[PDB]
Amino acid sequence: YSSAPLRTVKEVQFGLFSPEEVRAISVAKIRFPETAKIGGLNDPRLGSIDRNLKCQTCQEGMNECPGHFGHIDLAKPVFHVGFIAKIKKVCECVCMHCGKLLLDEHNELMRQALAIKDSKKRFAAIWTLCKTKMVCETDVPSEDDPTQLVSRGGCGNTQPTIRKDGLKLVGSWKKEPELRVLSTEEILNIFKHISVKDFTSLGFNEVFSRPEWMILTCLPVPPPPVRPTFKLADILKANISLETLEHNGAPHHAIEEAESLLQFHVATYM
Amino acid sequence: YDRKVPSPTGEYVKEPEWVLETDGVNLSEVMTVPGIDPTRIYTNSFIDIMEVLGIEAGRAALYKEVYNVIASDGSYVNYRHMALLVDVMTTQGGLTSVTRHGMRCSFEETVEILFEAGASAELDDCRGVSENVILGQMAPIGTGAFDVMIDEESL
Amino acid sequence: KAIPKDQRATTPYMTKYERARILGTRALQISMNAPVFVDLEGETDPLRIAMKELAEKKIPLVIRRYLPDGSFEDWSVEELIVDL
Amino acid sequence: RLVKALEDIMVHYDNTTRNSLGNVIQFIYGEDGMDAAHIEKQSLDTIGGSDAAFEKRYRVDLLNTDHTLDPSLLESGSEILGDLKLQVLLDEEYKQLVKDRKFLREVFVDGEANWPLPVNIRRIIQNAQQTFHIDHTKPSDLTIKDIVLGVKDLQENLLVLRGKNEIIQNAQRDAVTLFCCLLRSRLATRRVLQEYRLTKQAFDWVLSNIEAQFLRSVVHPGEM
Amino acid sequence: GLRFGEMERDCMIAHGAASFLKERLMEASDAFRVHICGICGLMTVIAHNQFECKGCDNKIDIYQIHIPYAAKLLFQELMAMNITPRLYTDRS
Amino acid sequence: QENERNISRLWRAFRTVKEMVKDRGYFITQEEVELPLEDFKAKYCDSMGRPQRKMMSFQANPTEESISKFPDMGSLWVEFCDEPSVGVKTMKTFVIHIQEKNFQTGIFVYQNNITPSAMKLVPSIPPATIETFNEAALVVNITHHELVPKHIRLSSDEKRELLKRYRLKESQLPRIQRADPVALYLGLKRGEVVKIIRKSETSGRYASYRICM
Ligand SMILES: [Zn+2]
Ligand SMILES: [Zn+2]
Ligand SMILES: [Zn+2]
């Protein structure tokens, strides 16, 4: 018997888990790939294999015990599998150096796009106009004259064309040309710099879905009820050998292989 | 055509009139030719009507069309039913397609729709039958559009 | 988000859905040996009993009607007029 | 496809139809608040015939010995010839009829007179003529005031919306506009006395039955 | 065949028979009883008497909902993929 | 020729504009609207017949029930140029005239075109809005058509009361596009609500509402 008021669900608010909240709600920091004992970490206190007992955590169940969440701290950030296409599209709108939207209220047809009510219809339209923008323009025509220019904030720098190369995103700059994979850490910073206004324009929500959360820095680990496998074990093993490589300051290519090994696992998870 | 029109003494009387029926449409330009009555001009292309006369005209024409299709085979359907359809298709200010195409909630259930739900910060109001089934609850339709609770002042 | 007994603008009539759900809710309780509130002059069927109770205005339930914007009006079954 | 587009539309306790986001689709269901299962083809009389026909049918002119009410149609029929104060009431009623006829002629531009409406006044009346064994060969004991005031009051009671503000009150006036045309055309004084021959008792029962059938015809919140 | 598919669902909606709709379309999956935070709205509640979120930092704004076990699973599956399915007993 | 089928098209358009301006709440007299082809043929005559537009132009003042309800608003300059295609130069003389009169609306009625390059002098002097019309889509008054019900612009007061009593958020009203022929005719701005009063086969009179998107 439970003390709590009984209710029905009236609303469901969808959103992305922030890294801070995943940390906020976990019952255990998790990071060694082993299940004697017990029960590294993992699986604490997550918990209750079967029966008795009785957590921790908590105090029932099994069968009463909900199951609880742990977290793994990812040595580097990684793309969320599901959002690469979005992540790419956002990059195609935001200036890739300074974070500013590539077109704004000064542009003829961007005003028409911004007015759109349904936030998927609007994102479509904004992306359509900006994937063309090949510069983060410092100054613009306005009305008026031209002659008279009008200034914005950013910045000058050229934009890349972005290609999907499996799980990596590839850049292409000029106006022969300069190729460069765009690293996760780099996009994570761009996204963090996009304004509340600019990312709302873009269909994100400042409370429930900031675009940076599309980039994972902190995996939620599901409890035994969710996995009554061991993919996490491999995600962990990749995560380990990536930390034990920075700790050894080993060459750029070595860090990168182990980074995309981790990417590979958080991705196929998932 | 025959036209039912009141007479100087009051009763409806048939006044026949010459009408022109065309193949092809240019509403804006024809509407404007001298000798016609532009207050009565009509076309079966409710799209052109909405573009020249506006949605409210667009709406009424859309009604006349759906109506004719049903009437064409002798059958009769109460006004409100087609009125409702026509309002749904018209309510956002343009002509929204119906059949096209086109929560939560839940048949495929393309994880990809939940991903966008997540990134969009989409808020499910939970009025459908289906999200209420997943949640094991009565849907707020008909018999469940209200709560019931114990009275605590009846003798 | 609660609107006083004196400013109710909703119908003073019980709806056909209200009646169905009330009759069904009482029926269930009668069907489970819950005390009854009228002379069953022969009646043994929970729904028929439930109907006798409604008729004679002795169902102590309240209907909470929700307005689209979340506010709500409360009407006792005792209060509502039953003509359908 | 049709089901999918409409599936979430529902009538709410404020008489509006809305979709699941709660967006208004019709401010009142069917533009009249009614359930289609309580609605039936009825004739809007007011609308057809010549003007001569209309005047002969509706006009009561107590101040004219030829277009007054025959003393035989009415107990107060001879106390009433010349009655100025009562003619003022009868001129409100005629003007309201004239207005209605004009108005209906706008809405149904081709003069079609049979339109689905709630409450079958004709039948309520044939019931009354039967229940009360209406002696067609005697004066009624209805006064002019009984009818004119009676009918005005009944309209105040055909409720579809209940809110006490200027806006809902107008919406309500709009909702029963067509029905009230029907009503005033069926319960025109002359028509009541000469054609139907109702007694004060029968008439009082016609009114309250129209009210009851009317409220019984309103759509019920929760209808999908 | 014997079936209750989309089109029968629609008739019962047209009748507004919502209890029947609930009963036919549900399951023996029986009410798993979970606790939800009133501020966030996740099944993050550590429920002796007995309960706090963390948080949120919440101790006095908690509810209790019954949901099909599959639901609870699908919501955790959703959480494990960094999506938050927040459950509210409210309307915005 | 038959530049007299042209005086006609021009005279009918002048008529529409006068009606439009009238239905917006400005003081035009019905006698004005009803200006005979022949009086028009004279008051704006040049001989050999011809136009001429610049003379047509005219100022326009709100009424007293107008500023009863929309007290704010202002006055209006309607202009008929005069040359088939309107470049950047001939737009600025208009754009400046409006300005230096604190006219809160200018309606520019043009014959064939303005350049996509002069259309950018438009949203250019706030709050005063500038609107354009092809004479072509002015030759007939759309609002006079059978299927066009009566749209009444609501005050922001009537709007407040509407939203309050149906207890609605703005986003729940039915919508009307800023460029809907009827919004264009009444000059609707984003956020304004129209009351639409239509005759109805079920209830005789039904009023719905659209908010301008
Ligand atoms: Zn536990
Ligand atoms: Zn930049
Ligand atoms: Zn919480």
Curated annotation (Swiss-Prot), chain C:
<dbReference type="GO" id="GO:0006366">
    <property type="term" value="P:transcription by RNA polymerase II"/>
</dbReference>
<keyword id="KW-0240">DNA-directed RNA polymerase</keyword>
<feature type="region of interest" description="Leucine-zipper">
    <location>
        <begin position="40"/>
        <end position="61"/>
    </location>
</feature>
<dbReference type="GO" id="GO:0003899">
    <property type="term" value="F:DNA-directed RNA polymerase activity"/>
</dbReference>
<dbReference type="GO" id="GO:0006383">
    <property type="term" value="P:transcription by RNA polymerase III"/>
</dbReference>
<dbReference type="GO" id="GO:0006386">
    <property type="term" value="P:termination of RNA polymerase III transcription"/>
</dbReference>
<dbReference type="GO" id="GO:0006367">
    <property type="term" value="P:transcription initiation at RNA polymerase II promoter"/>
</dbReference>
<dbReference type="GO" id="GO:0003677">
    <property type="term" value="F:DNA binding"/>
</dbReference>
<dbReference type="GO" id="GO:0006362">
    <property type="term" value="P:transcription elongation by RNA polymerase I"/>
</dbReference>
<dbReference type="GO" id="GO:0006363">
    <property type="term" value="P:termination of RNA polymerase I transcription"/>
</dbReference>
<comment type="function">
    <text>DNA-dependent RNA polymerases catalyze the transcription of DNA into RNA using the four ribonucleoside triphosphates as substrates. Common component of RNA polymerases I, II and III which synthesize ribosomal RNA precursors, mRNA precursors and many functional non-coding RNAs, and small RNAs, such as 5S rRNA and tRNAs, respectively. Pol II is the central component of the basal RNA polymerase II transcription machinery. RNA polymerases are composed of mobile elements that move relative to each other.</text>
</comment>
<comment type="similarity">
    <text>Belongs to the archaeal Rpo6/eukaryotic RPB6 RNA polymerase subunit family.</text>
</comment>
Curated annotation (Swiss-Prot), chain D:
<comment type="similarity">
    <text>Belongs to the RNA polymerase beta' chain family.</text>
</comment>
<protein>
    <recommendedName>
        <fullName>DNA-directed RNA polymerase II subunit RPB1</fullName>
    </recommendedName>
</protein>
<comment type="function">
    <text>DNA-dependent RNA polymerase catalyzes the transcription of DNA into RNA using the four ribonucleoside triphosphates as substrates. Largest and catalytic component of RNA polymerase II which synthesizes mRNA precursors and many functional non-coding RNAs. Forms the polymerase active center together with the second largest subunit. Pol II is the central component of the basal RNA polymerase II transcription machinery. During a transcription cycle, Pol II, general transcription factors and the Mediator complex assemble as the preinitiation complex (PIC) at the promoter.</text>
</comment>
<comment type="subunit">
    <text>Component of the RNA polymerase II (Pol II) complex consisting of 12 subunits. Interacts with DEF1; the interaction is direct and serves to bridge RPB1 to the Elongin complex in a DNA-damaged dependent manner. Interacts with the Elongin subunit ELA1. Interacts with the Elongin subunit ELC1. Interacts with ASK10. Interacts with ESS1. Interacts with RTT103. Interacts with SHE2.</text>
</comment>
From Swiss-Prot, chain E:
<protein>
    <recommendedName>
        <fullName>DNA-directed RNA polymerase II subunit RPB2</fullName>
    </recommendedName>
</protein>
<feature type="binding site">
    <location>
        <position position="37"/>
    </location>
    <ligand>
        <name>Zn(2+)</name>
    </ligand>
</feature>
<feature type="binding site">
    <location>
        <position position="40"/>
    </location>
    <ligand>
        <name>Zn(2+)</name>
    </ligand>
</feature>
<comment type="subunit">
    <text>Component of the RNA polymerase II (Pol II) complex consisting of 12 subunits.</text>
</comment>
<feature type="binding site">
    <location>
        <position position="56"/>
    </location>
    <ligand>
        <name>Zn(2+)</name>
    </ligand>
</feature>
<comment type="function">
    <text>DNA-dependent RNA polymerase catalyzes the transcription of DNA into RNA using the four ribonucleoside triphosphates as substrates. Second largest component of RNA polymerases II which synthesizes mRNA precursors and many functional non-coding RNAs. Proposed to contribute to the polymerase catalytic activity and forms the polymerase active center together with the largest subunit. Pol II is the central component of the basal RNA polymerase II transcription machinery.</text>
</comment>
<feature type="zinc finger region" description="C4-type">
    <location>
        <begin position="37"/>
        <end position="56"/>
    </location>
</feature>
<comment type="similarity">
    <text>Belongs to the RNA polymerase beta chain family.</text>
</comment>
<feature type="binding site">
    <location>
        <position position="53"/>
    </location>
    <ligand>
        <name>Zn(2+)</name>
    </ligand>
</feature>
Swiss-Prot record, chain F:
<dbReference type="GO" id="GO:0042790">
    <property type="term" value="P:nucleolar large rRNA transcription by RNA polymerase I"/>
</dbReference>
<comment type="subunit">
    <text>Component of the RNA polymerase I (Pol I), RNA polymerase II (Pol II) and RNA polymerase III (Pol III) complexes. Component of the RNA polymerase I (Pol I) complex consisting of 14 subunits: RPA135, RPA190, RPC40, RPA14, RPB5, RPO26, RPA43, RPB8, RPA12, RPB10, RPC19, RPC10, RPA49 and RPA34. The complex is composed of a horseshoe-shaped core containing ten subunits (RPA135, RPA190, RPB5, RPO26, RPB8, RPB10, RPC10, RPA12, RPC19 and RPC40) where RPA135 and RPA190 form the DNA-binding cleft.</text>
</comment>
<dbReference type="InterPro" id="IPR014381">
    <property type="entry name" value="Arch_Rpo5/euc_Rpb5"/>
</dbReference>
<dbReference type="GO" id="GO:0006363">
    <property type="term" value="P:termination of RNA polymerase I transcription"/>
</dbReference>
<comment type="similarity">
    <text>Belongs to the archaeal Rpo5/eukaryotic RPB5 RNA polymerase subunit family.</text>
</comment>
<dbReference type="GO" id="GO:0006386">
    <property type="term" value="P:termination of RNA polymerase III transcription"/>
</dbReference>
<dbReference type="GO" id="GO:0005665">
    <property type="term" value="C:RNA polymerase II, core complex"/>
</dbReference>
<dbReference type="GO" id="GO:0006366">
    <property type="term" value="P:transcription by RNA polymerase II"/>
</dbReference>
<keyword id="KW-0240">DNA-directed RNA polymerase</keyword>
<dbReference type="InterPro" id="IPR005571">
    <property type="entry name" value="RNA_pol_Rpb5_N"/>
</dbReference>
<dbReference type="GO" id="GO:0005654">
    <property type="term" value="C:nucleoplasm"/>
</dbReference>
<dbReference type="InterPro" id="IPR000783">
    <property type="entry name" value="RNA_pol_subH/Rpb5_C"/>
</dbReference>
